[PDB]
Design a binder for this molecule. Structure first.
Ligand code: P1T
Ligand code: P1T
Lengths: 475, 475
């Protein structure tokens, strides 16, 4: 029906939470998991992360205790999501935001908190928690040097675990109808795992609770699990620290799973590909840990996994296959990159142009010929396409179809230069380039034009249907 | 309460829709609008756009008519969001996706549909609808040359308007409780405006319906409104075409508003800043048109505006102030860029270093000194910070605090080189740079080191607290 959203909302703050639970049947079938793998899609909140709840809640606690008045300044150390939540709460309720975040965190978080009118001071990645150049020490310094400033200190404030104990765990219970057998949840601030696991074990003591920790952190128990990469910086953002936060009750969690960067990212891409959940990397870590932990479960039992972040914050980082190749991470089992590498291999455009049959007789024009002259030349040469170029270095491609239709549409004068109607988006290539690379370039450019670049004697233009016909010649 | 999400979902497809309605009280107060400006936050759907509904629905229609079997190929021309929705539906229900989208559309849409296992063929931006190099003609060609392929043709399929007439308009009616005075909604495919306006005028004939069209399209009525930039390419993505789609019933809409790129983008940034809705550019266009149209309304009346897209698809394009400056768009009335330009102006770091007082006596090391030697030098020189550099070109900064804490943490051996513990994230600057630029660079780098680059004689390091103290000297 319609109970929570059947009305109009006073502000975006009331749109936090109420996130659905989806069954990852396809992903379980992919990885061969018998039980029901349920996913709590926290990234569908207003700000696209679970920490929005605690942001709103810490603001509510600061307001119910009268410790907060309009015009004040809020300071908060964060990996990026709590900064977003508190920036939302401030832009709504009229507070000033100052965010401290390590340089390791993505740039999208910074851009978004800048759009939200929040000041951003960054800290070095390698700084330990004891350093005054850590985000927490710098936040303390800003509190000491700024007037009317407040730190909510998500690492030690009780609102962070108490709210996941109050509403989120109750949401999971109400939608799972009490039947929860395993709960896999990342260990960042530790507030969400503490709260959720505490409430669940109170209302379902038979439920196991598994925590996810990236290889590099010291949050796992025992210390035999941390020695993989002790205090080695990792790419996964949001989870793991070099110290135990104040809100983390490591006794409420039963098992611990260490997860590396590669598995986290490849599993995040697998989630996106197989379920269609635009999710973050920490969620890949959580789901990989869940797949490792709930293997022994049987059908009917439900393993609940948290999906903390959206792809929005890592859109440029790991959604782009370029950056994952730069860091050498397995793309996915079934991915477009592996598909292209399988079909093309090292086949270069020389091979395609040779097997197809061309003589590099692509006409050229100085890009300011009148369209009358260029159509006379096109009709005298019988070609359909032409390439326009300048003297100071390419302009683009131009076809007779666009000529006619633009002349009819009133955008192409007879005396106008051909540069005005040519296609200006182009991708330059050279015969040594592989077919996989031109396939990746076709994802962003409609045509791909070749050149020798030794005279500028281009041999032809390449489009996706050309590669499709070439693959039709193969099998 | 909990009616629509109180259970577990079979797949992500069932998480489409059910989007909340938020009152834009702060934005109305910013622009001086008396009535209640309501916003339908369609970007909170599973795939972050309104077109997910029609994607799911066209798949449902193709399945209820038996025209669709597993393993088939789906082809669809789109500006990017329908491609995402149909890619979700295919990755869930086991169909193959091939997407045709103009080169004008953002790269995030391409990356996301690549993650969803969809093939992407792009078309030139300047191509007219009649051209066979248009996305629609290329889609037709692919249908002709591919086996088991289907085109759902969102421009002419009745599912697109019928579903907005069935559920979305009913959602808006149920949450507005029937009282809707004005409805402002962008004109892209025209299906959403047709369906919603038809249902509303059926259930509330006194409601006016206003359509939003970017300057460049020919969808507005009359033709006196299109002559601003006739068929001139524009940056706004999703709305406006060079022809009337089959599903668009231009008679159901009363007024038409033309919106340019600058207003759309600046209003999108204003929405993000003042309400905290991570929204797209087309939504900026819609909200600007609404602010222009509902000006004559009075208190109590409700003007409903659609927010079609999320910032996720335009994260690199217009959220980044760099690209908006590259295209010369007014950032916002209150924005971080204007704030920094107001406080700093053209003040350069030469002025700051001169007024503060320094002698460029920053120590240097060849980045492989033993930490014992570097701490002996640091204690003999009394300085706290040091800059480490190589011979083949900078390594970073290094402080005694991190030295001590890493020696205690077991990451810094006494015989180890200083390069292992130095801070490796840095931003190079030069004295001619303004303070606004170093403030923008501090958004992404913790330290900013200067250099003359004429000997490499750096004068000092700059952090955000340095600029804060400098501004404390000002007013
Ligand atoms: C510590 C912070 N992040 C917690 C977090 C986590 C860990 O969740 P916790 O419940 O806080 O332990 C997982 N994934 C992401 C993307 C996260 O941002 C923060 O935003 O300050
Ligand atoms: C035409 C398409 N976009 C419609 C759209 C619109 C226009 O909505 P329509 O209801 O289709 O007219 C507005 N904003 C965005 C971001 C959109 O994607 C498409 O995805 O194929």
């Amino acid at each position: 029906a319609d109970g929570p959203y059947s009305g109009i909302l006073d502000s975006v703050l009331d749109a936090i939470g109420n996130t659905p639970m989806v069954r990852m049947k396809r992903l379980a079938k992919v990885y061969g998991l018998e039980c029901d793998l349920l996913a709590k899609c926290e990234f569908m909140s207003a700000g696209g992360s679970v920490k929005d709840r605690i942001g709103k809640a810490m603001v509510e606690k600061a307001e119910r205790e009268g410790r907060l008045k309009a015009g004040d300044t809020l300071i908060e150390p964060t990996s990026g999501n709590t900064g977003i939540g508190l920036a939302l709460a401030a832009a709504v309720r009229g507070y000033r935001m100052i965010v401290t975040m390590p340089a390791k965190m993505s740039a999208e978080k910074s851009n978004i908190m800048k759009c939200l009118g929040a000041e951003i001071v960054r800290t070095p990645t390698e700084a330990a928690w004891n350093d005054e150049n850590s985000h927490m020490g710098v936040a303390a310094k800003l509190q000491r040097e700024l007037e009317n400033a407040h730190i909510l200190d998500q690492y030690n404030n009780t609102a962070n675990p108490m709210v996941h104990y109050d509403v989120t765990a109750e949401e999971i219970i109400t939608q799972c109808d009490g039947d929860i057998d395993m709960v896999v949840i990342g260990a960042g601030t530790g507030g969400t795992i503490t709260g959720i696991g505490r409430k669940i074990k109170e209302r379902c003591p038979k439920c196991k609770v598994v925590g996810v920790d990236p290889k590099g952190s010291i949050l796992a128990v025992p210390d035999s699990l941390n020695d993989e990469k002790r205090l080695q910086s990792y790419e996964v953002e949001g989870i793991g620290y070099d110290f135990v936060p104040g809100v983390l009750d490591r006794k409420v969690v039963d098992e611990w799973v260490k997860v590396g960067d590669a598995e986290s990212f490849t599993t995040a891409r697998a989630i996106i590909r197989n379920e269609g959940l635009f999710v973050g990397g920490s969620s890949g870590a959580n789901v990989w840990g869940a797949l490792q932990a709930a293997r022994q479960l049987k059908k009917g039992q439900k393993c609940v996994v948290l999906l903390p972040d959206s792809s929005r914050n890592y859109m440029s980082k790991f959604i782009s296959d370029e950056w994952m190749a730069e860091h050498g991470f397995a793309p996915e089992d079934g991915a477009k990159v592996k598909e292209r590498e399988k079909q093309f291999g090292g086949a270069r455009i020389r091979d395609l142009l040779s097997e197809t049959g061309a003589t590099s007789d692509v006409p050229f024009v100085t890009a300011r010929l009148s369209v009358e002259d260029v159509i006379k030349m096109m009709h005298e040469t019988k070609v359909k396409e032409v390439i326009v170029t300048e003297d100071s270095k390419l302009v683009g491609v131009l076809s007779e179809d666009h000529i006619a239709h633009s002349l009819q549409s009133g955008r192409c004068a007879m005396q106008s230069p051909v540069k005005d109607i040519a296609f200006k988006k182009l991708a330059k290539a050279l015969p040594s380039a592989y077919l996989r690379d031109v396939a990746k370039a076709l994802d962003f450019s409609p045509y791909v034009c070749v050149m020798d670049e030794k005279c500028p004697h281009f041999l032809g233009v390449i489009t996706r249907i050309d590669l499709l016909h070439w693959l039709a010649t193969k099998q």
